[PDB]
Short mmCIF file of C-alpha atoms and ligand atoms in Angstrom, two decimals:
data_model
loop_
_atom_site.label_atom_id
_atom_site.label_comp_id
_atom_site.label_asym_id
_atom_site.label_seq_id
_atom_site.Cartn_x
_atom_site.Cartn_y
_atom_site.Cartn_z
CA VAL W 31 0.17 -0.18 0.06
CA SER W 32 1.17 3.27 -0.81
CA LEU W 33 1.48 6.30 2.01
CA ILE W 34 -1.04 8.38 0.12
CA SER W 35 -3.63 5.01 0.29
CA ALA W 36 -2.96 5.25 3.55
CA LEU W 37 -4.08 8.48 4.03
CA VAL W 38 -6.68 8.60 2.18
CA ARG W 39 -8.16 4.93 3.75
CA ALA W 40 -6.78 6.83 7.35
CA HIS W 41 -9.38 9.35 6.49
CA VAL W 42 -12.33 7.57 4.70
CA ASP W 43 -12.16 4.86 7.28
CA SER W 44 -12.84 8.04 10.42
CA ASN W 45 -15.76 10.61 8.39
CA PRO W 46 -19.05 8.66 8.13
CA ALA W 47 -20.04 8.07 5.03
CA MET W 48 -22.41 10.54 2.06
CA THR W 49 -24.38 7.51 1.94
CA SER W 50 -25.40 6.75 5.57
CA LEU W 51 -25.80 10.17 6.51
CA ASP W 52 -28.45 11.38 10.21
CA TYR W 53 -31.02 13.76 9.20
CA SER W 54 -32.98 12.77 11.91
CA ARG W 55 -32.26 15.70 14.30
CA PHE W 56 -32.18 18.76 11.58
CA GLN W 57 -33.85 21.50 11.22
CA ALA W 58 -33.86 24.49 8.49
CA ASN W 59 -35.36 26.79 10.92
CA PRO W 60 -35.38 25.88 14.32
CA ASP W 61 -37.26 27.08 17.44
CA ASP W 62 -29.57 28.59 26.31
CA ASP W 63 -30.42 24.82 27.27
CA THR W 64 -28.27 22.60 29.25
CA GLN W 65 -28.92 20.25 26.04
CA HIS W 66 -27.30 22.22 23.56
CA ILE W 67 -24.32 22.35 25.56
CA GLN W 68 -24.47 18.60 26.76
CA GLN W 69 -25.21 18.04 22.78
CA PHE W 70 -21.55 20.70 21.57
CA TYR W 71 -19.72 17.89 24.67
CA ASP W 72 -20.93 14.58 23.10
CA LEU W 73 -19.63 16.33 19.94
CA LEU W 74 -16.41 17.00 21.23
CA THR W 75 -16.04 13.82 22.98
CA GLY W 76 -17.58 11.34 20.19
CA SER W 77 -14.90 13.44 17.80
CA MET W 78 -12.30 12.47 20.13
CA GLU W 79 -12.33 8.71 19.93
CA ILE W 80 -13.09 9.13 15.57
CA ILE W 81 -9.76 11.49 15.14
CA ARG W 82 -8.16 8.77 17.45
CA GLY W 83 -8.89 6.01 15.79
CA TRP W 84 -7.78 8.35 12.50
CA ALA W 85 -4.74 8.63 14.32
CA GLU W 86 -3.71 5.29 14.15
CA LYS W 87 -3.66 5.08 10.99
CA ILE W 88 -1.30 6.97 9.45
CA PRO W 89 1.50 5.09 9.18
CA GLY W 90 3.89 5.64 11.37
CA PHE W 91 2.01 7.37 13.99
CA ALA W 92 1.85 4.02 16.29
CA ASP W 93 5.51 3.74 15.79
CA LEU W 94 6.26 6.94 17.94
CA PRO W 95 6.54 6.18 21.69
CA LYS W 96 2.92 6.21 23.45
CA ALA W 97 3.94 10.03 25.44
CA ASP W 98 4.87 11.45 21.53
CA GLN W 99 1.61 10.04 20.12
CA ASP W 100 -0.22 11.86 22.94
CA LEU W 101 0.97 14.91 22.51
CA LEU W 102 0.92 15.15 19.08
CA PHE W 103 -2.74 14.15 19.02
CA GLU W 104 -3.76 16.60 21.90
CA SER W 105 -2.33 19.16 20.57
CA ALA W 106 -3.56 18.83 17.23
CA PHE W 107 -6.97 17.50 18.55
CA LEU W 108 -9.40 21.09 18.04
CA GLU W 109 -7.29 21.71 15.06
CA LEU W 110 -8.48 17.92 13.47
CA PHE W 111 -12.50 18.65 14.42
CA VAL W 112 -12.16 21.80 12.80
CA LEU W 113 -10.42 20.85 9.63
CA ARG W 114 -12.45 17.71 8.77
CA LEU W 115 -15.78 19.25 10.21
CA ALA W 116 -15.02 22.10 7.58
CA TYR W 117 -13.96 19.78 4.81
CA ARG W 118 -17.15 17.32 5.51
CA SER W 119 -19.56 19.85 5.81
CA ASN W 120 -21.75 22.02 3.25
CA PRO W 121 -21.63 25.73 4.05
CA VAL W 122 -23.41 27.55 1.42
CA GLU W 123 -26.62 25.26 2.83
CA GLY W 124 -25.28 25.75 6.90
CA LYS W 125 -24.97 22.19 6.93
CA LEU W 126 -22.77 21.04 9.72
CA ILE W 127 -22.41 17.10 9.07
CA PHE W 128 -20.56 15.87 12.46
CA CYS W 129 -18.42 12.64 12.48
CA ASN W 130 -21.17 11.02 13.50
CA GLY W 131 -23.02 11.60 10.19
CA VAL W 132 -25.86 13.73 12.59
CA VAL W 133 -26.74 16.65 10.18
CA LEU W 134 -27.56 19.87 12.19
CA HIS W 135 -28.13 23.56 10.53
CA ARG W 136 -25.59 26.28 11.95
CA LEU W 137 -28.66 28.01 13.77
CA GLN W 138 -28.85 24.68 15.93
CA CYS W 139 -25.34 24.70 16.43
CA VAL W 140 -25.58 28.27 18.11
CA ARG W 141 -26.12 27.41 21.15
CA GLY W 142 -24.30 24.93 21.84
CA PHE W 143 -21.19 26.13 19.86
CA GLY W 144 -21.93 30.06 20.14
CA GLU W 145 -19.90 32.47 17.27
CA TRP W 146 -17.34 29.22 16.93
CA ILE W 147 -19.82 27.75 14.73
CA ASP W 148 -19.65 31.37 12.42
CA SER W 149 -15.64 30.71 12.39
CA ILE W 150 -16.17 27.63 11.10
CA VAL W 151 -18.17 27.94 8.71
CA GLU W 152 -16.73 30.90 7.44
CA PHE W 153 -13.30 28.64 7.58
CA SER W 154 -15.17 25.39 5.55
CA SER W 155 -16.18 28.11 2.68
CA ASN W 156 -12.79 29.01 2.56
CA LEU W 157 -11.70 25.91 2.35
CA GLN W 158 -14.15 25.01 0.17
CA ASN W 159 -13.44 27.39 -2.25
CA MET W 160 -9.90 25.51 -2.86
CA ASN W 161 -10.91 22.14 -4.35
CA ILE W 162 -8.92 20.49 -1.91
CA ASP W 163 -9.22 16.46 -3.45
CA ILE W 164 -9.88 13.68 -0.89
CA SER W 165 -5.97 12.66 -1.35
CA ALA W 166 -4.70 16.52 -0.94
CA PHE W 167 -7.10 16.40 2.37
CA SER W 168 -5.23 13.27 3.98
CA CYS W 169 -2.27 14.77 3.39
CA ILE W 170 -3.16 17.81 4.70
CA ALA W 171 -5.06 16.16 7.90
CA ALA W 172 -1.98 14.06 8.73
CA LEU W 173 0.21 16.75 8.75
CA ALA W 174 -2.05 19.32 11.31
CA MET W 175 -1.00 16.37 13.53
CA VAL W 176 2.09 15.20 12.11
CA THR W 177 4.07 18.15 12.79
CA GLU W 178 6.85 19.71 15.34
CA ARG W 179 6.03 20.20 18.79
CA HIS W 180 7.82 20.97 22.01
CA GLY W 181 9.29 18.00 24.43
CA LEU W 182 9.07 14.95 21.75
CA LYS W 183 10.97 12.10 22.64
CA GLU W 184 11.81 11.00 18.52
CA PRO W 185 11.12 14.71 17.26
CA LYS W 186 13.73 13.76 14.16
CA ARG W 187 11.13 10.65 13.29
CA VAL W 188 8.07 13.03 13.40
CA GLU W 189 10.21 15.47 10.78
CA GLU W 190 10.94 12.69 9.00
CA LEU W 191 6.97 11.28 8.91
CA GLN W 192 6.49 15.09 8.09
CA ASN W 193 8.96 15.01 5.27
CA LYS W 194 7.52 12.06 3.53
CA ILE W 195 3.84 13.37 4.15
CA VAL W 196 4.68 16.23 2.24
CA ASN W 197 6.53 14.96 -0.53
CA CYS W 198 2.92 12.69 -1.04
CA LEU W 199 1.51 16.11 -1.68
CA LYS W 200 3.87 17.45 -3.65
CA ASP W 201 3.94 14.67 -6.25
CA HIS W 202 0.02 14.16 -5.72
CA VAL W 203 -0.19 18.04 -6.64
CA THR W 204 2.22 17.88 -9.90
CA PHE W 205 0.92 14.39 -11.51
CA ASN W 206 -2.86 15.59 -11.10
CA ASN W 207 -1.45 19.12 -12.80
CA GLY W 208 -0.05 17.31 -15.72
CA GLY W 209 3.25 17.00 -14.82
CA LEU W 210 4.08 20.89 -14.13
CA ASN W 211 4.51 22.67 -10.74
CA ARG W 212 1.81 24.24 -8.73
CA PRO W 213 4.24 25.60 -5.73
CA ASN W 214 2.19 28.98 -4.48
CA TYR W 215 -1.33 26.67 -4.78
CA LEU W 216 1.09 24.00 -2.89
CA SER W 217 2.01 27.22 -0.18
CA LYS W 218 -2.35 28.29 -0.21
CA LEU W 219 -2.83 24.18 0.55
CA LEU W 220 -0.36 24.25 3.72
CA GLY W 221 -1.21 27.93 4.66
CA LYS W 222 -4.69 26.61 5.76
CA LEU W 223 -3.53 25.08 8.87
CA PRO W 224 -1.88 28.52 10.67
CA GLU W 225 -5.53 28.92 9.70
CA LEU W 226 -6.57 26.05 12.31
CA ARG W 227 -4.54 27.26 15.43
CA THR W 228 -6.88 30.34 15.86
CA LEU W 229 -10.05 28.13 15.44
CA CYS W 230 -8.61 26.45 18.05
CA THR W 231 -8.04 29.17 20.21
CA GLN W 232 -11.56 30.09 19.26
CA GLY W 233 -12.60 26.35 20.37
CA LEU W 234 -10.79 27.21 23.83
CA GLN W 235 -12.07 30.68 24.63
CA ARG W 236 -16.15 28.53 23.73
CA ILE W 237 -15.25 26.04 26.49
CA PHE W 238 -13.60 28.65 29.00
CA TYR W 239 -16.98 30.51 28.33
CA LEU W 240 -19.15 27.99 29.50
CA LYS W 241 -17.18 26.40 32.05
CA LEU W 242 -17.13 29.94 33.88
CA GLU W 243 -21.20 30.08 32.63
CA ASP W 244 -21.33 26.31 34.83
CA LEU W 245 -24.38 25.62 33.69
CA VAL W 246 -23.37 22.07 32.35
CA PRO W 247 -19.77 21.60 33.31
CA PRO W 248 -17.43 19.72 30.58
CA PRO W 249 -17.13 16.07 31.08
CA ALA W 250 -13.84 14.85 33.07
CA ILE W 251 -11.57 14.31 29.69
CA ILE W 252 -12.64 17.49 28.71
CA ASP W 253 -12.00 19.81 31.02
CA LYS W 254 -8.90 17.72 31.74
CA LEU W 255 -7.25 18.19 28.48
CA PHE W 256 -8.72 22.35 28.51
CA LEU W 257 -7.09 22.97 31.96
CA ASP W 258 -3.92 21.29 30.90
CA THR W 259 -3.43 23.00 27.45
CA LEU W 260 -4.21 26.76 29.51
CA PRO W 261 0.01 29.01 29.97
CA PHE W 262 -1.80 29.71 33.70
C1 RPG M 568 -4.99 25.15 19.62
C2 RPG M 568 -4.50 26.17 19.31
C3 RPG M 568 -4.34 26.80 20.79
O1 RPG M 568 -4.25 27.79 21.11
C4 RPG M 568 -3.88 25.72 21.57
C5 RPG M 568 -2.95 25.67 22.73
C6 RPG M 568 -2.94 26.74 24.10
C7 RPG M 568 -1.56 27.32 23.35
C8 RPG M 568 -1.15 27.59 24.65
C9 RPG M 568 0.12 28.47 25.31
C10 RPG M 568 1.24 28.63 23.47
C11 RPG M 568 2.55 28.10 24.55
O2 RPG M 568 2.94 29.14 25.25
O3 RPG M 568 2.86 27.17 23.75
C12 RPG M 568 -4.41 24.38 21.09
C13 RPG M 568 -5.37 23.80 21.36
C14 RPG M 568 -4.89 22.64 21.61
C15 RPG M 568 -6.23 21.28 21.89
O4 RPG M 568 -6.71 20.08 21.57
C16 RPG M 568 -5.99 21.13 23.51
C17 RPG M 568 -7.64 19.93 24.08
C18 RPG M 568 -8.74 20.35 23.64
C19 RPG M 568 -9.37 20.94 25.09
C20 RPG M 568 -10.42 20.28 24.80
CL1 CL M 569 -13.68 14.86 13.24
MG1 MG M 570 -4.07 27.93 37.23
#
């Protein structure tokens, strides 16, 4: 199996299928609930598990020390939640498609996600305007996780894996352009990664707000990851 094939499989097998989406909760025009907050947390915790399975399907990832795996996964989690949500969704219709296949309107997400959902949809729109095929996306997603972080036990190995993925992506882009390079396109593509950082911080801000509001406290796994991430 080629590396890009393995990256595509990791992506496809960790995303809901277009042929089995769940519309049973969707409302194009719905009518503060503790319910919306709870669901917001459920969507984050359900997504953690699926992204963890995705990460374990990236060749080389399971070869890293357990601490390195945890560091990479935990540091990238919210970025990945946003990236994959934005790729899967239908921003023009205001349709968010979560990793379990549940389709919800933007207006349904507003009570749980606050403003952050609006930032997500905007980024989705910008991302989809770039016409990133499945193979290129699979590489980009991997690169949001397989990246330099401070305090890795095997940073050279992470860097080699990063470089292998970058080279897949490069060859893929060039091949799909009939053998000519697209170095500016590749730049714009990799430029989507720094933009995920802002979206991550906005997700942290939402959890911060909900924790302070204290109507529904975050569940232990979110609380722990949230608190451990804080510089204070
Ligand atoms: C995503 C972007 C962030 O702002 C956050 C890093 C936090 C900033 C730490 C200070 C910078 C430094 O000095 O190193 C990243 C969040 C990652 C997130 O997945 C952590 C777990 C989410 C909790 C639910
Ligand atoms: Cl996800
Ligand atoms: Mg403190």
